[PDB]
Design a protein around this ligand. Structure first.
Ligand code: CLA
Ligand code: CLA
Ligand code: CLA
Ligand code: CLA
Ligand code: CLA
Ligand code: CLA
Ligand code: CLA
Ligand code: CLA
Ligand SMILES: CCCCCC(=O)OC\C(C=C=C1C(C)(C)C[C@H](OC(C)=O)C[C@@]1(C)O)=C/C=C/C(C)=C/C=C/C=C(C)/C=C/C=C(\C)C(=O)C[C@@]12O[C@]1(C)C[C@@H](O)CC2(C)C
Ligand SMILES: CC1=C(/C=C/C(C)=C/C=C/C(C)=C/C=C/C=C(C)/C=C/C=C(C)/C=C/C2=C(C)CCCC2(C)C)C(C)(C)CCC1
Ligand code: SF4
Ligand code: SF4
Ligand code: SF4
Lengths: 107, 30, 161, 40, 80, 140, 733, 87
């Protein structure tokens, strides 16, 4: 309630170190209005190790998506009949994406 | 203070100017 | 001195600006514990402010009634640390850039695919012209005397008028 | 590297971005070492 | 109605006639080029002035020229 | 052909559109296009929508010459019909023949046409507009 | 025929609403109308000149009559520094009670407008003291307008229409203009000053009944005839004169003290009469130049044909310029507008620099309004001169008459001119924007000492050379025992030095780095507007994209989407583009003047000197700070006399905003919308019986550009005038 | 009308550019140019060697003589024109 969130620090080269304002808690930086701090507090991420490992997992998932994008255009590209299964796509999205994401997040 | 007779004299002169303006505009005509 | 201006080393308003600038950061400094990198950054800012003001006093700049340095672009020799010497420096650097671009343009014109040599740069040749443009005031003068710098004028396209 | 990857790196946007990054880095390091210069 | 003129730099490549959406232009015989034809504008009252003929001309500074002039119910393209 | 139009030619089956001719077609000027089809098929109307063209002979009223010529372009570049005829109907029931005038398409050469608007010099040799001042004429 | 464009058969047969718009828009284009000859064109222009002159004098008579009838001239004469001048009384059935009490100001008891045109001071100097004098002046100007209207009617009569040879008489017309219309009028004004205005300043009452028996000088025509002209300069008004009264007054009618009257803060009335007499003599001598009927004098054709540099330096010289100027009314009009624009910019500079009307430079609202007035009018005339030069190039320039001329060579090297204007504009814009952004970032980062502040040493040197002695340059007039400072030391120097070295005048305002930066901005604006106008004028006859542009006329929409696209290709579009740049640079000039004088009048020039070097200083210290009395003219707690200025401020905002409609959205969208509306009206019951005569169509492309530009300009003027009036009125300093 | 005064194809203007003084020989033009220049410089020097005063020291003869300095410019130009013309 008195510490202002801040997660972005500037490099002092040209006098721009004045942007590192007094956000409280013995810290200097640019105030953050994204609401990521409250989002992390709503998940129980009270430690600063879990944020680091979430960042590492995000990097791993980004590398996975890059590999999948290369793989499905240069190695295993589905045919037109695969994409036109809109009933199968609709069922799989509605259950496995949305309902299982809600179920796992509720857990 | 400007009297009413003076204002009416100015109005008469302006009326004559209006009639001449109409005459000039209709001498250029449409 | 010039235009009624006083030197910044002999101006009281310049020193008052110095005191205000260091006092703002000193007031910002009081809410941090010592040894923390925030405290070190703030005292580094204070030292940098003091060094900048001392340099502006020592370089011989002229400050006005507002206590801010005023540059004299007149051309006087005692103010050549102002405009004139950066003027010569920029003129040399800009002529360097222009001559490098012109030389690479001549080379790309003389090739078989002039269009593909401009979106995809021939990097070794481009570096060659780019480094060889260091003697541009002499090479440009030689091309001007030789008549290769300028088209005659009857060979450039012109609008009908 | 390759004979055709270097040709892609020789394109106008890649070379422009690399050279502007080099120029910005050089000027930023000059400002880091020689700061707050008004006169020569 | 707009006025359409065809100059003698015509090569008879017929693209202006095909590009015309109002049947203004047509090909007449001629002997000043290799194709033996020159464009003509016998129905300039049906000209709308969209200058699709001038986009289709390949000659340097186009031979078929449309000058915008008086406006009628046809040259304005009015359906009402 | 000549300035005659069969008013009783069947029309394409169309559900009615809000793109048809307005009041100034029975007052000022109206256009019609007639073509011959080989089969019953669906074509896109120039005034939006889709209509079924009848097998045989068709007649369709439009409001401007651009719509008729756009429909003729559709009947050419698509499924091949090249015998369409475009007319112009006046409010006093007078018809005038416009497209395929001399009987052949304008892009093909036809002996018997007279060049109209041809200029015997290049476009850069037109007179200056000073030389036509206070005359009413132009430099075209 | 009977249709409205009787002058255009092409427009009369237009079945759409475009006919009405183009008939209104092309009414004055007398060269292009149907069946127009040169002689009839010149006669119609002469009659229109008479009508316009009558309109001018009717407007001035209306100003005089309204100040005489509903004004407070009687009260304002007795106390000029504290009584607000009155324009006219307000009649509005829309007013509430509190608006009636709010606008009831001055000495009068009715709702009223406070005049910001400075007509009170001007009439007060020239001898007006009562409402009867203003009423008699109004009657005289009404009779003059009546006479001019009758003369305009008379010169279209068959026996009174002058021939074409009378109009092209350059030597006679210039002789008569230069002698009579300038010199004799200036001589008559000097006579009026000496006979009426100078005695009224000294307490004497000179009117039409006693002027012919009252001597303006105690001797009277004896110093003039004997040659002792210095007797008219002896015993001037002392520096305790008190304007309108007689204590400390003098008996001099022609002096050149120089400087300002100490009480009124304006120039001496005896200096002005002397100035007018000198200008009168000079103009009469100058009008004694051209050969008319008596052998002596010049021929203007021979002077132009002779001026050829010896070996082809300027081509064929000025040969053929006499035939082109006389036969083209667009070139004469362009020269006239260029000279008049320079003249009204000069009056804008000199009326705040050297005020001539008593008790101005203390109202500050007339002082702001007159300057902004004349600067905007100067920009308009300057743009119009180049526009008519482009029109002259389009449809009046003969290339065979001007073979190797000084005018054809301008078209020969037009690419060099446009490219070098491009270089100057790009250089100025790059550098002044870079300096301004540098100062912005330096001030924002807490380090104002890192700003690049160039001291304007050249203009300060000029001020020192005129006599200003705080820069310490010690040159010419600022240094005594100098040839310039000694030669004039006993004619006009002491008054000039006591007027230039005081801090209460606007003579040569002290300038710093902000003045340097904003002068560079002004030079940027002038060069870019000149770029657009000169490029349009020189490419009016054709370019690479359109080599036959002269065949399509001065104004046409485009040349189609072919060969890349030809949007805004005509010279009219170059005028349309340069109009925005003129408005921008005039706004810059007026912003600089208004903020500098707002800080000087309040005794706080340090605020300008510190905040003018960066853009945020302008934004937060001039515009944001000075809008507070304006936008608070009416609010949730009531209203005051500036509610009309707040309403007009929002009005100008809305007009400037709805210009962006026509400037950004183009015809096609609107034509389809109109067609849908046409179907709607034709296919609804009850209302389809009402039928239009002209088919509704969208506005044409050139018409749309004109309408959007007119909206932009009207909104521009109507949002700057309330600010520049109410902010000065809301501060009184 | 007027006279053909254009001389762009010649190295000197014709004698008719001088108007009423088109027949004055070059020597008279040069001598009067020198005399007018000397008298005009003397007359304008009598305004800075002696301080010109408000009416007391104006000396209208020096004012009328001050117009000889721009007149001396036209006389030495006309001297050159007549010299190239052979007159
Ligand atoms: C239950 C099965 C399932 C699931 C979960 C998905 C999920 C997804 N599909 Mg998909 N799809 C499916 C079946 C499924 N599909 C089938 C059967 C077909 C064929 C008919 C398709 C055809 C298809 C197409 C054509 C496209 C997708 C796309 C997408 C993505 C939508 C973007 C989004 O919401 O980002 C949400 C992002 C996330 C949830 C991040 C996680 C990403 C992984 C890959 C999700 C699965 C993880 C794994 C199974 C769960 C492990 C649990 C473990 C931790 C215990 C999303 C990742 C679109 C896309 O983005 O392509 C890449 C797309 O274009 N799908
Ligand atoms: C190295 C190439 C080069 C050179 C020598 C010039 C030279 C010139 N230009 Mg120019 N110009 C260039 C590139 C170049 N230009 C490019 C790329 C553009 C498009 C942005 C322009 C746009 C331009 C305009 C709009 C104008 C000029 C003008 C001028 C003239 C006056 C100087 C000036 O205003 O500079 C100012 C230059 C710029 C604003 C553009 C600089 C852009 C970069 C920094 C230069 C390009 C460097 C290039 C990438 C190097 C690659 C080569 C390498 C492989 C070896 C001068 C003849 C003016 C003129 O006509 O005056 C007579 C004028 O109005 N130029
Ligand atoms: C065209 C306008 C313009 C000009 C003239 C300048 C000029 C300058 N700026 Mg500036 N600036 C500009 C635009 C401009 N900037 C803009 C648009 C911004 C906002 C983005 C800024 C933001 C800005 C900041 C925030 C700072 C400057 C600083 C400086 C100074 C740095 C001197 C330096 O590094 O020399 C040393 C560099 C060299 C000698 C380079 C030469 C390198 C080669 C290898 C030498 C070769 C020689 C042969 C200099 C006076 C800095 C300063 O000191 O302030 C006073 C600073 O802190 N500027
Ligand atoms: C001496 C004789 C004489 C005089 C006085 C005039 C006077 C005039 N002629 Mg004219 N004319 C004459 C002989 C004369 N003419 C002859 C012999 C010919 C034939 C060869 C013509 C042919 C002729 C034509 C063809 C036309 C005129 C026109 C005009 C009018 C010009 C418009 C105007 O009001 O500008 C008045 C301008 C000034 C008084 C001076 C303006 C310039 C200065 C710099 C302005 C600033 C001064 C001062 C600071 C202002 C401040 C005042 C106050 C607010 C403080 C004017 C009434 C025109 C006209 O309007 O027709 C009706 C026109 O079209 N004349
Ligand atoms: C023999 C030659 C001669 C000389 C040297 C003089 C000398 C003089 N005369 Mg004079 N005069 C002469 C012959 C001469 N007169 C003859 C033949 C007549 C007619 C009978 C007159 C009638 C005459 C009158 C009526 C007056 C003089 C006056 C004067 C004195 C004026 C001094 C001065 O500075 O003028 C002042 C100079 C100016 C005002 C302007 C100078 C510019 C030129 C010279 C103006 C010349 C007139 C001009 C063309 C306008 C007239 C045109 C007319 C249609 C309006 C001066 C002593 C005046 C005086 O007070 O005497 C004591 C005076 O009132 N003279
Ligand atoms: C002494 C000055 C003078 C004179 C005699 C002329 C005379 C002429 N100009 Mg011109 N002009 C002038 C000044 C002058 N102009 C200036 C200063 C500019 C720059 C702004 C222009 C720009 C200009 C252009 C661009 C063109 C002309 C054209 C013409 C010719 C035809 C005029 C016409 O059709 O208008 C008829 C009258 C109108 C169209 C009236 C329009 C009303 C305007 C838009 C103002 C409306 C806004 C209104 C006041 C808003 C009210 C606000 C309120 C609600 C609060 C004519 C020879 C045209 C021409 O034929 O050239 C070939 C042409 O194309 N002039
Ligand atoms: C704020 C709005 C704005 C701005 C900034 C400009 C800017 C410009 N207009 Mg313009 N214009 C505008 C609104 C604006 N216009 C509007 C509303 C209209 C009405 C339609 C026009 C109509 C118009 C016409 C008709 C013409 C222009 C022209 C110009 C150019 C003038 C030359 C100049 O100043 O170069 C300075 C360049 C800039 C200010 C652009 C910014 C470039 C960078 C970001 C500046 C950064 C500063 C510093 C140098 C950074 C260092 C760079 C780093 C890589 C080292 C310039 C590009 C003229 C032109 O092109 O002539 C050459 C021209 O003919 N304009
Ligand atoms: C500053 C420019 C200038 C120049 C170069 C000239 C040059 C000339 N003028 Mg002149 N003049 C000038 C200004 C000038 N004047 C002014 C300002 C006026 C108004 C007072 C006159 C009024 C004037 C008249 C009335 C006459 C001349 C005449 C002459 C010519 C004859 C000179 C001669 O031979 O004397 C020996 C000569 C070419 C005469 C001439 O020959 O006419 C063509 C002639 O009659 N001028
Ligand atoms: C008796 C003298 C003897 C020596 C002089 C002389 O005769 O040499 C003549 C000569 C050469 C020669 C000779 C020949 C003719 C060729 C042959 C001769 O042999 C013969 C007879 O054949 C010999 C010789 C050598 O002589 C050359 C002459 C050159 C000459 C005479 C050059 C004048 C410039 C004037 C200027 C620039 C004016 C500027 C004027 C200015 C700047 C102003 O008006 C300012 C102004 O403020 C002023 C001042 C007053 C105000 O109201 C107006 C304003 C405010 C505007
Ligand atoms: C387009 C055109 C046109 C127009 C143009 C224009 C518009 C122009 C402008 C121009 C201008 C607008 C110019 C300006 C000028 C200015 C000047 C030229 C100035 C001068 C000044 C001076 C010379 C001064 C000096 C001085 C003195 C004496 C005082 C002291 C100081 C000093 C030294 C500064 C025309 C119609 C012709 C025709 C053709 C086309
Ligand atoms: S497109 Fe142009 S060049 Fe070709 S036939 Fe038509 S008019 Fe001639
Ligand atoms: S302007 Fe349009 S309708 Fe007219 S001839 Fe050209 S293409 Fe055909
Ligand atoms: S229609 Fe509009 S966009 Fe297209 S060329 Fe004409 S003006 Fe330009």
């Amino acid at each position: 309630t008195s510490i202002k969130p801040s997660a972005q620090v500037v490099w002092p080269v040209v006098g721009q170190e004045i942007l590192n304002g007094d956000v409280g808690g013995g810290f200097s930086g640019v105030q953050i209005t994204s609401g990521v701090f409250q989002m992390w507090r709503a998940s129980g991420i009270t430690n600063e190790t879990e944020l680091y490992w979430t960042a590492m997992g995000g990097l791993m998932m980004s590398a996975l998506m890059v590999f999948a994008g290369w793989f499905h255009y240069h190695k295993a590209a589905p045919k037109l009949e695969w994409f036109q299964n809109v009933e199968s796509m609709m069922n799989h999205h509605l259950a496995g994406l949305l309902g299982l994401g809600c179920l796992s997040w509720s857990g | 203070m400007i009297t009413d007779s003076q204002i009416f004299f100015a109005l008469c002169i302006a009326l004559t100017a209006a009639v001449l303006a109409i005459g000039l505009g209709r001498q250029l005509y449409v | 001195d010039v235009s009624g201006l006083t030197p910044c080393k002999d101006s009281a308003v310049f020193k008052k600006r110095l005191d205000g600038s260091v006092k703002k950061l000193q007031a910002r400094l009081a809410n941090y514990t010592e040894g923390t990198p925030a405290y070190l950054a703030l005292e580094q800012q204070i030292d940098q402010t003091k060094a900048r003001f001392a340099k502006y006093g020592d370089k011989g700049l002229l400050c006005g009634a507002d206590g801010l340095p005023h540059l004299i672009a007149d051309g006087r020799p005692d103010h050549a640390g102002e405009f004139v010497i950066p003027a010569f420096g920029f003129l040399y650097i800009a002529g360097w850039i222009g001559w490098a671009g012109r030389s690479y343009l001549q080379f790309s014109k003389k090739t078989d695919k002039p269009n593909e040599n401009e979106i995809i740069i021939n990097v070794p040749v481009a570096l060659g012209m780019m480094s060889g443009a260091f003697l541009w005031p002499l090479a440009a003068w030689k091309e001007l005397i030789n008549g290769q710098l300028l088209v005659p004028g009857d060979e450039v396209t012109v609008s009908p008028r | 590297m390759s004979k055709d990857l270097l040709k892609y790196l020789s394109t106008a946007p890649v070379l422009l971005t690399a050279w502007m990054s080099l120029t910005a880095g050089m000027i930023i390091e000059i400002q880091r070492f020689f700061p707050d210069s008004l006169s020569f | 109605s707009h006025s359409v003129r065809v100059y003698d730099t015509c090569i008879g490549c017929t693209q202006c006639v095909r590009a015309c959406p109002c049947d203004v232009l047509e090909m007449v015989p001629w002997d000043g080029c290799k194709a033996g034809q020159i464009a003509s504008a016998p129905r300039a009252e049906d000209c709308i002035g969209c200058k699709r003929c001038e986009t289709a001309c390949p000659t340097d500074f186009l031979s078929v020229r449309v000058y915008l002039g008086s406006e009628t119910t046809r040259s304005l393209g009015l359906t009402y | 052909t000549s300035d005659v139009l069969n008013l009783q030619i069947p029309t394409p089956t169309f559900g009615g559109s809000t793109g048809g001719w307005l009041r100034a077609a029975e007052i000022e000027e109206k256009y019609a296009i007639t073509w011959t089809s080989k089969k019953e098929q669906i074509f896109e109307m120039p005034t939006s929508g889709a209509a079924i063209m009848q097998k045989g002979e068709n007649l369709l009223y439009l409001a401007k010459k651009e719509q008729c010529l756009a429909l003729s372009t559709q009947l050419r570049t698509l499924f091949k019909i090249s015998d369409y005829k475009i007319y112009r109907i006046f409010p006093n029931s007078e018809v005038q023949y416009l497209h395929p005038k001399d009987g052949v398409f304008p892009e093909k050469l036809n002996e018997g046409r007279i060049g109209v608007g041809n200029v015997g010099y290049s476009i850069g040799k037109n007179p200056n507009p000073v030389n036509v001042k206070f005359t009413g004429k132009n430099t075209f | 025929a009977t249709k409205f464009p009787k002058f255009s058969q092409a427009l009369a047969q237009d079945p759409a609403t475009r006919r009405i718009w183009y008939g209104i828009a092309t009414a004055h284009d007398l060269e292009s109308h149907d069946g127009m000859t040169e002689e009839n064109l010149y006669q119609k222009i002469f009659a229109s000149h008479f009508g316009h002159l009558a309109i001018i004098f009717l407007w001035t008579s209306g100003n005089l009559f309204h100040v005489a009838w509903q004004g407070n001239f009687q009260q304002w004469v007795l106390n000029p520094l504290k009584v607000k001048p009155i324009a006219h009384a307000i009649w509005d059935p829309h007013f509430g009670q509190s608006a009636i009490k709010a606008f009831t100001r001055g000495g009068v008891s009715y709702p009223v407008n406070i005049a910001t045109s400075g007509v009170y001071h001007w009439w007060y100097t020239v001898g007006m003291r009562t409402n009867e004098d203003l009423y008699f002046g109004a009657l005289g100007l009404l009779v003059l307008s009546t006479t001019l209207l009758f003369a305009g009617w008379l010169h279209l009569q068959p026996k009174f229409r002058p021939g074409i040879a009378w109009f092209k008489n350059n030597e006679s017309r210039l002789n008569h203009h230069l002698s009579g219309l300038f010199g004799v009028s200036s001589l008559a004004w000097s006579g009026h000053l000496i006979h009426v205005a100078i005695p009224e300043s000294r307490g004497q009452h000179i009117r039409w009944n006693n002027f012919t028996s009252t001597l303006p000088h105690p001797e009277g025509l004896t110093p003039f005839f004997t040659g002792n002209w210095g007797l008219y300069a002896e015993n001037p008004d002392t520096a305790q004169h008190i304007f309108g009264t007689s204590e400390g007054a003098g008996t001099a009618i022609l002096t050149f003290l120089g400087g300002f009257h100490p009480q009124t803060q304006s120039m001496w009335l005896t200096d002005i009469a002397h100035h007018h007499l000198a200008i009168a003599v000079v103009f009469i001598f100058a009008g004694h130049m051209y050969r008319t009927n008596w052998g002596i004098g010049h021929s203007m054709k021979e002077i132009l044909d002779a001026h050829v540099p010896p070996k082809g330096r300027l081509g064929a010289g000025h040969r053929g310029l006499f035939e082109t100027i006389t036969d083209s009314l667009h070139m004469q009009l362009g020269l006239a507008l260029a000279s008049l624009g320079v003249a009204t910019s000069l009056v804008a500079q000199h009326m705040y620099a050297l005020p001539s009307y008593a008790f101005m430079a203390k109202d500050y609202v007339t002082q702001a309004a007159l300057y902004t007035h004349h600067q905007y009018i100067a920009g308009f005339l300057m743009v119009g001169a180049f526009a008519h030069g482009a029109i002259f190039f389009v449809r009046d320039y003969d290339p065979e008459v001007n073979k190797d001329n000084v005018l054809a060579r301008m078209l020969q090297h037009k690419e060099a001119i446009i490219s070098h204007l491009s270089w100057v504009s790009l250089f100025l814009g790059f550098h002044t924007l870079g300096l301004y952004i540098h100062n912005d970032v330096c001030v924002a980062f807490g380090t104002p000492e890192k700003q690049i502040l160039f001291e304007p040493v050249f203009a300060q040197f000029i001020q020192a050379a005129s006599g200003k002695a705080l820069y310490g340059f010690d040159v010419l007039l600022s240094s005594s025992t100098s040839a310039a400072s000694v030669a004039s030391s006993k004619i006009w120097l002491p008054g000039w030095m006591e007027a230039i070295n005081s801090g209460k005048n606007s003579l040569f305002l002290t300038i710093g780095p902000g003045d340097f930066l904003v002068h560079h901005a002004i030079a940027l604006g002038l060069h870019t507007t000149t770029l657009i106008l000169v490029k349009g004028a020189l490419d009016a006859r054709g370019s690479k994209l359109m080599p036959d542009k002269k065949d399509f006329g001065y104004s046409f929409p485009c040349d189609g989407p072919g060969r890349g696209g030809t949007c805004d290709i005509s010279a009219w579009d170059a005028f349309y583009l340069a109009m925005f740049w003129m408005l921008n640079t005039i706004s810059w000039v007026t912003f600089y003047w208004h903020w500098k004088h707002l800080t000087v009048w309040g005794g706080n020039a340090a605020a300008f000197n510190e905040s003018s070097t960066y853009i945020m200083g302008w934004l937060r210290d001039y515009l944001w700070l000075n809008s507070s009395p304006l936008i608070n003219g009416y609010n949730a707690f009531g209203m005051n006399a500036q509610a009309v200025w707040a309403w007009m401020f929002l009005f100008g905002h809305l007009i400037w905003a709805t210009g962006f409609m026509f400037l950004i959205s183009w015809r096609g969208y609107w034509q389809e919308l109109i067609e849908t509306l046409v179907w709607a009206h034709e296919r609804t019951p009850i209302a389809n019986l009402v039928k239009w005569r002209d088919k509704p169509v969208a506005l044409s492309i050139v018409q749309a550009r004109l309408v959007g530009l007119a909206h932009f300009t009207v909104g521009f003027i109507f949002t700057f005038a309330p600010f520049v009036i109410a902010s000065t009125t809301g501060k009184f300093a | 009308e007027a006279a053909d005064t254009w001389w762009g194809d010649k190295d000197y203007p014709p004698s008719i550019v001088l108007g009423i003084g088109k027949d004055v020989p070059s020597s008279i033009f040069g001598v009067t140019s020198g005399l007018a220049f000397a008298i005009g410089v003397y007359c304008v020097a009598q305004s800075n060697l002696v301080n010109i005063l408000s009416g007391s020291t104006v000396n209208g003869f020096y004012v009328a003589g001050a117009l000889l300095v721009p007149y001396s410019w036209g006389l030495h130009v006309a001297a050159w024109i007549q010299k190239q013309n052979g007159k």
